[PDB]
Amino acid sequence: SEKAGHQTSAESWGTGRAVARIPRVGGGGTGRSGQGAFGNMCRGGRMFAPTK
């Protein structure tokens, strides 16, 4: 599906927070909050070169 792995509002936190620069989910009190988002290496992300 062309939607898979891109239904998130994640933004990279930037350097200076002792964490990588991969985009991350916002908010609180969920458990998904602060995870990896779009990336191809990220759980629940998007696959490399989605099959067309």
Per-residue DSSP letter, 24: E
34 binds other proteins (CB under 8 A): yes
Give the closest residue to 5 by CA, choosing from 51, 50, 30: 50
Q: The dihedral of CA 33, 34, 36, 37: what is its sign?
A: positive
**Residue list 1-52, contact with RNA (CB under 7 A):** 1-10, 15-22, 25-36, 39, 41-45, 47-48, 51
Q: Which two tokens stand for residue 40?
A: 């191809």
Residues in contact with RNA by CB under 7 A are 1-10, 15-22, 25-36, 39, 41-45, 47-48, 51
Residues in contact with other proteins by CB under 8 A are 7, 16-18, 28-31, 33-34, 52
